[PDB]
Structure formats: C-alpha cells, structure tokens
C-alpha cells in the first residue's frame, strides 16, 4: 500500500444539514421508546455496527 | 496497491440535507417504538450493519 | 491495482435532499413500531447489511 | 358591518411554498434586468398595485 | 364597526416557506440589475404599492 | 370602532422562513446592482410603498 500523490477520504461524513422547525413528537403509554435527532456515524474498519436504536417494551392496561 | 496521483472518496456520505418543518408525530399505545431523523453512516470495511433499528413488543389491554 | 490519474468515488451517497412540511405521522395501538426519515448508508466492503430495520409484534385486546 | 361569531380571513396569504435546487440563471447584455424568487403580497383596501417589477431598457453594441 | 366575538386576520402573510440549494445567479454586462430572494409584505390600507423593484439601464459597447 | 372580544392580527407578517445553502451569486460589470434575501414588511396605513429596489445604470465600453 502506498499514496504517492493522493487525497483519499475513507469513512468519511461531511457536509450534513439539519433545520427542524415548529415540530412536534409525542410518546403516551410506550413500554421502551427511542427517538433521535441526527446521527454521523464514519469508521474505516468495524467488526460490529454503526449505529444501534433497539426498543422492547410492553403495556397491559 | 498504490494512487500515484488521485482522488478517491470510498465510503462516503456528503452533501445531505433535511429540512423539516411543522411535522407532528405520535405514539400512543406501543410496546417498543423507534423514532429517527437523519442517520447518515459510511465505512469503508464492515462485517456488520451500517444502521440497526429494532423493536420487539406487546400490548394486552 | 492502481490509479495514475483518477478520480474514483466507490461507495458514495452525496447531494441528497428532503423537505418534509406540515406532514403527520400516528401510531395508535402496535406491538412494535419503527418509523425513520433519511437514512444515507455507505459502504466499500460489507459482509452484512447497509440499514436493517425490523419490527415484530402482537396485540391482542 | 359587525361579526357576532365569526373567522374571516380578507386578504391573506398563507401557506406558501418554494423548493428550488440546482437551478441557474444567467443575464448577459441587458439594459436593465429585474429576477425575483417568491413575492407574497397582501392587501385589504389598495389604491395602487400589490406587485410591480418595470424594467427600460437599450443595447447599443 | 364592531367584533363581539371573532378572529379577523386582516392583510396578513404568514406561514411562507422557501427552500433553494445550490443555485447559481450571474448577470455580467448590466446597466442596472435587480435580484431578490423572498419579499413578503402585508398591508391593510394603501394609497401606493406592495412591492416595486425597477431598473432603467444602458448598455453600449 | 370596537372589539368586544376579539383577535384581529391587522397587517401582519408572520411565520417566514428561508433556507439557502450552496448558492452562488455573481455580478461582474453592472451599473447599480440591488441584491436581496428576506424582506419581511408590515403595515397598517401607508401612503407610499412597502419595499422599493431600483436600480438606475449605465455601461459605455
């Protein structure tokens, strides 16, 4: 492996943009909830994930 | 292996854009609830996922 | 391999856009739920997945 | 004139909307050159105009 | 003139929304130029205009 | 004139937004130039105007 004249982005996350406004969320009765907003995730090398949002509830009532 | 001269973007995630605006959102009655906005990921080498999002529930009533 | 003179994007997600306005989502009685935006997955190598994103349930009333 | 139990919107304007992306404009050899985007304009009781884009020109070459 | 019980939006601009992304604008020979975005104006009693944008120009070359 | 109960939102502007990203704006030979983005105005009795831009030029070469 050699770069003799290079410019080499790898797992790279640039120039992203978010503009929320007057928004709404609401959650009531939720056994297990998750909610996000933005997520920049880069890696070059990965054995597992990138990004992991699991949920698990319940409700009887 | 080698880049004498070069540009090489490998992996990448550039120039998103989100523009939300007034939006609503509910969950009432849920066992597990995921909720995301922007998730922007990029590797370069994975054994994985690049985005996991799972939700197991349950409702009696 | 190799590049003398190039320019070579591999695996890329650039110059994405959304506009979401006066929208509306509602979940009222699920066992599992997963309600997602924008979702830029990128990769050079993967032995698995870019986005999963999974969702079982029950509701029995 | 009176309103007992009323809702009158009278010269409104409300719920615009404008995405533009990637566009070009271009003006060259003009006299005189007038380029709008979005113009919302609203009146109740109006002795004139609401929008008014002149332009006089002369190219000679 | 009168309102027991009302809601009177009178000359009104509300809720406008605009979303432009790389655009690109030139003017290069111009006696006189003009360029606007958004403009939003709102009145309820006018004895002239809105909005007036002119240009008077000349070009000889 | 009277208002016994009443909302009356008389030459109003609101609720305006503008999102500009990446854009690009040139003028390279131009007599009088006039360049704008937001230009929110609001009366409620006027004799003249709302918003002028003129632009008066002149290129020999």
Do not use: P, R
Request: avoid cysteine.
């Amino acid at each position: 492996v050699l770069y003799v004249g290079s410019k080499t982005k790898e797992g790279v996350v640039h120039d992203v943009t978010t503009v929320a406004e007057k928004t709404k969320e609401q959650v009531t009765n939720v056994g297990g909830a998750v909610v996000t907003g933005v997520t920049a995730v880069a890696q070059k090398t990965v054995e597992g994930a990138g990004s992991i949002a699991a949920a698990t509830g319940f409700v009887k009532k």
